[PDB]
Structures are given as C-alpha cells and as structure tokens.
Amino acid sequence: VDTSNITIPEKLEYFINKYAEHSHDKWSMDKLANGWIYGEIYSDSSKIQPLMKPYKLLSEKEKEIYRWPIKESLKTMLAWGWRIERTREGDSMALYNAAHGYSPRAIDMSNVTLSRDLHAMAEMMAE
C-alpha cells in the first residue's frame, strides 16, 4: 500500500511518550527472570546494562530503540484516512491489570475479541 504524505494532528505526540512507560514493565518482566537487575555500571560480571534505568530516566545515548517501530504504522492508516479517535475516559488499564518501587503490572493475554475494524487495524500495522 503506497503512501505519499501526511498532515497529522497535534494530539498525536503522547502515544509514543506513553509507549515506553508501559513497555519498560514488560522489559523488566523479561529480564528479571534472568540474572539481570539494576546496578552501578555496565559489566559482564554484575549483568548490568545502560538501558536498566526507570522509563522516564532513559539516557540520550539510547532512546530511539524503543520509539522507532510504532509511528511507521500510522502512516498507512492516517494517509488513506483511517481513524484514531478517543473517548473522554483515558486512563483505563491503571485499575485493570528495584529502585523507585518498580515492578511490572502484567496486562492479561488470555482475553481478546476481534471484529472488522479491529482485525483490520491489527493486520494493517503488522503488515
């Protein structure tokens, strides 16, 4: 599906900011089962990385690793003119489910239902 250009609205800036805040929880859940944990500095003995900081305190030397492969999906939707509308509610998954008291809040995986627009959007972005 060829795509030419886009004039996006100013509202579409906080999706990518809120992505990493929720993706770092799954990264912590992935790497906590292994022998990886917060520490002082990167070293093979202590099993420390530079990514292992809070989701807000991500260094400038790596930020695009989280934020790259999301926005190139929205071109195929919004260029043809698909919709990304929103209700007035907003924060919903806060209720419905280590420095700084960190720990993951696992969203459920064994519950999902699909329809025309939903399967369409999922297949469009994964495509």
Binding site: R86, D91, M93
Partner: peptide
C-alpha cells in the same frame, strides 16, 4: 495498549 485504554474508533 491502544484499544482498551480509553479508545474507540468508528
């Protein structure tokens, strides 16, 4: 993360 986060598309 997109769908049931206070989001509707129609």
């Amino acid at each position: 993360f997109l769908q049931i986060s206070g989001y509707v598309v129609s």
